[PDB]
Protein backbone atom coordinates (compact mmCIF):
# COMPACT_ATOMS: atom_id res chain seq x y z
CA UNK A 1 0.00 0.00 0.00
CA UNK A 2 0.80 3.69 0.21
CA UNK A 3 -0.47 6.77 2.02
CA UNK A 4 -0.38 10.32 0.71
CA UNK A 5 3.14 10.70 2.15
CA UNK A 6 4.39 7.56 0.40
CA UNK A 7 2.80 8.76 -2.83
CA UNK A 8 4.67 12.07 -2.54
CA UNK A 9 7.93 10.20 -1.94
CA UNK A 10 7.05 7.99 -4.92
CA UNK A 11 6.70 10.92 -7.31
CA UNK A 12 9.70 12.82 -5.91
CA UNK A 13 11.72 9.66 -5.76
CA UNK A 14 10.84 8.42 -9.25
CA UNK A 15 11.87 11.79 -10.69
CA UNK A 16 15.14 11.46 -8.78
CA UNK A 17 14.61 14.97 -7.39
CA UNK A 18 14.31 15.96 -3.77
CA UNK A 19 11.28 17.52 -2.16
CA UNK A 20 10.26 20.70 -3.96
CA UNK A 21 7.64 23.21 -2.88
CA UNK A 22 4.76 21.40 -4.56
CA UNK A 23 5.38 18.16 -2.69
CA UNK A 24 5.76 20.10 0.55
CA UNK A 25 2.42 21.76 -0.20
CA UNK A 26 0.85 18.33 -0.59
CA UNK A 27 2.34 17.17 2.72
CA UNK A 28 1.12 20.38 4.37
CA UNK A 29 -2.35 19.61 3.02
CA UNK A 30 -2.30 16.11 4.49
CA UNK A 31 -0.86 17.32 7.78
CA UNK A 32 -3.59 19.93 8.03
CA UNK A 33 -6.29 17.30 7.50
CA UNK A 34 -4.59 14.77 9.80
CA UNK A 35 -6.39 15.53 13.06
CA UNK A 36 -9.79 15.50 11.44
CA UNK A 37 -9.02 12.09 10.01
CA UNK A 38 -7.86 10.85 13.40
CA UNK A 39 -11.06 11.86 15.18
CA UNK A 40 -13.15 10.44 12.36
CA UNK A 41 -11.36 7.09 12.69
CA UNK A 42 -11.88 7.32 16.44
CA UNK A 43 -15.64 7.80 16.05
CA UNK A 44 -16.01 5.00 13.49
CA UNK A 45 -13.93 2.76 15.77
CA UNK A 46 -16.38 3.58 18.57
CA UNK A 47 -19.61 2.90 16.73
CA UNK A 48 -18.85 0.22 14.11
CA UNK A 49 -21.59 -2.15 15.31
CA UNK A 50 -24.25 0.54 15.17
CA UNK A 51 -23.10 1.58 11.69
CA UNK A 52 -23.52 -1.92 10.36
CA UNK A 53 -26.83 -2.40 12.25
CA UNK A 54 -28.36 0.86 11.05
CA UNK A 55 -27.07 0.40 7.50
CA UNK A 56 -28.41 -3.16 7.23
CA UNK A 57 -31.70 -1.86 8.72
CA UNK A 58 -31.92 0.82 6.07
CA UNK A 59 -30.67 -1.05 3.06
CA UNK A 60 -31.31 -4.79 3.25
CA UNK A 61 -33.98 -5.71 5.84
CA UNK A 62 -37.62 -6.55 5.16
CA UNK A 63 -37.09 -7.21 1.47
CA UNK A 64 -36.79 -10.13 -0.89
CA UNK A 65 -33.25 -10.73 0.26
CA UNK A 66 -33.94 -11.65 3.81
CA UNK A 67 -37.24 -13.28 2.81
CA UNK A 68 -36.81 -16.91 1.74
CA UNK A 69 -35.31 -17.27 -1.68
CA UNK A 70 -33.18 -14.27 -0.92
CA UNK A 71 -29.41 -14.34 -0.57
CA UNK A 72 -29.50 -13.43 3.13
CA UNK A 73 -32.23 -15.92 4.15
CA UNK A 74 -30.27 -18.50 6.25
CA UNK A 75 -28.46 -17.50 9.44
CA UNK A 76 -25.19 -18.52 7.81
CA UNK A 77 -25.73 -16.07 5.00
CA UNK A 78 -26.93 -13.29 7.24
CA UNK A 79 -23.76 -13.59 9.31
CA UNK A 80 -21.54 -13.72 6.23
CA UNK A 81 -23.30 -10.65 4.89
CA UNK A 82 -22.74 -8.45 8.00
CA UNK A 83 -19.21 -9.84 8.19
CA UNK A 84 -18.63 -8.53 4.61
CA UNK A 85 -20.05 -5.16 5.58
CA UNK A 86 -17.62 -4.99 8.49
CA UNK A 87 -14.74 -5.46 6.04
CA UNK A 88 -16.04 -2.63 3.89
CA UNK A 89 -16.26 -0.31 6.93
CA UNK A 90 -12.84 -1.32 8.27
CA UNK A 91 -10.89 -0.98 5.05
CA UNK A 92 -12.79 2.21 4.19
CA UNK A 93 -11.50 3.61 7.49
CA UNK A 94 -7.96 2.54 6.58
CA UNK A 95 -8.36 4.20 3.19
CA UNK A 96 -9.61 7.40 4.82
CA UNK A 97 -6.84 7.52 7.33
CA UNK A 98 -4.11 6.81 4.77
CA UNK A 99 -5.49 9.42 2.39
CA UNK A 100 -4.88 7.05 -0.54
CA UNK A 101 -7.21 4.24 -1.69
CA UNK A 102 -4.40 1.87 -2.70
CA UNK A 103 -5.34 -0.41 0.23
CA UNK A 104 -8.75 -0.95 -1.35
CA UNK A 105 -6.98 -1.88 -4.58
CA UNK A 106 -4.66 -4.36 -2.92
CA UNK A 107 -6.71 -6.16 -0.31
CA UNK A 108 -10.39 -5.66 -1.12
CA UNK A 109 -11.34 -5.00 -4.72
CA UNK A 110 -8.95 -7.57 -6.14
CA UNK A 111 -10.90 -10.63 -7.28
CA UNK A 112 -14.01 -9.61 -5.32
CA UNK A 113 -16.21 -9.17 -8.35
CA UNK A 114 -15.20 -12.64 -9.55
CA UNK A 115 -15.89 -13.97 -6.07
CA UNK A 116 -19.40 -12.50 -5.73
CA UNK A 117 -20.27 -13.40 -9.32
CA UNK A 118 -19.04 -16.88 -8.47
CA UNK A 119 -21.09 -17.32 -5.31
CA UNK A 120 -24.24 -15.55 -6.32
CA UNK A 121 -23.98 -12.38 -4.24
CA UNK A 122 -26.05 -9.62 -5.88
CA UNK A 123 -23.80 -6.65 -6.60
CA UNK A 124 -26.71 -4.16 -6.59
CA UNK A 125 -27.69 -4.83 -3.02
CA UNK A 126 -24.11 -4.83 -1.86
CA UNK A 127 -23.58 -1.37 -3.34
CA UNK A 128 -26.77 -0.08 -1.75
CA UNK A 129 -25.62 -1.46 1.60
CA UNK A 130 -22.27 0.28 1.27
CA UNK A 131 -24.01 3.56 0.44
CA UNK A 132 -26.17 3.09 3.52
CA UNK A 133 -22.92 2.82 5.51
CA UNK A 134 -21.86 6.02 3.80
CA UNK A 135 -24.94 7.94 4.94
CA UNK A 136 -24.86 6.58 8.51
CA UNK A 137 -21.12 7.11 8.82
CA UNK A 138 -21.36 10.64 7.45
CA UNK A 139 -24.09 11.26 10.01
CA UNK A 140 -21.70 10.20 12.78
CA UNK A 141 -18.50 11.96 11.72
CA UNK A 142 -20.04 15.10 10.27
CA UNK A 143 -19.77 16.99 7.03
CA UNK A 144 -16.06 17.18 6.16
CA UNK A 145 -15.09 13.76 7.41
CA UNK A 146 -18.27 12.42 5.83
CA UNK A 147 -16.98 13.73 2.51
CA UNK A 148 -13.70 11.90 3.09
CA UNK A 149 -15.39 8.64 4.11
CA UNK A 150 -17.86 9.05 1.25
CA UNK A 151 -15.07 9.18 -1.31
CA UNK A 152 -13.67 5.83 -0.13
CA UNK A 153 -17.07 4.14 0.13
CA UNK A 154 -17.72 5.45 -3.38
CA UNK A 155 -14.37 4.01 -4.36
CA UNK A 156 -15.39 0.52 -3.24
CA UNK A 157 -18.81 0.91 -4.90
CA UNK A 158 -17.08 1.98 -8.10
CA UNK A 159 -14.86 -1.08 -7.73
CA UNK A 160 -17.63 -3.65 -7.48
CA UNK A 161 -19.80 -2.03 -10.13
Amino acid sequence: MQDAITAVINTADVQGKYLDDNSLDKLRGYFETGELRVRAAATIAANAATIIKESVAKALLYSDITRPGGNMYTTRRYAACIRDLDYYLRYATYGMLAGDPSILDERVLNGLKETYNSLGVPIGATVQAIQAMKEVTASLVGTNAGQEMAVYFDYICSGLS
Binding site: Q2, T6, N10, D13, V14
Partner: peptide, 9 residues
Protein backbone atom coordinates in the same frame (compact mmCIF):
# COMPACT_ATOMS: atom_id res chain seq x y z
CA UNK B 1 6.25 -0.33 -0.95
CA UNK B 2 7.85 3.10 -1.11
CA UNK B 3 9.79 2.33 -4.25
CA UNK B 4 7.59 0.96 -7.00
CA UNK B 5 8.26 0.22 -10.67
CA UNK B 6 5.67 1.83 -12.90
CA UNK B 7 6.31 1.70 -16.61
CA UNK B 8 4.86 5.23 -16.62
CA UNK B 9 7.85 6.57 -14.67
Amino acid sequence: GYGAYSYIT
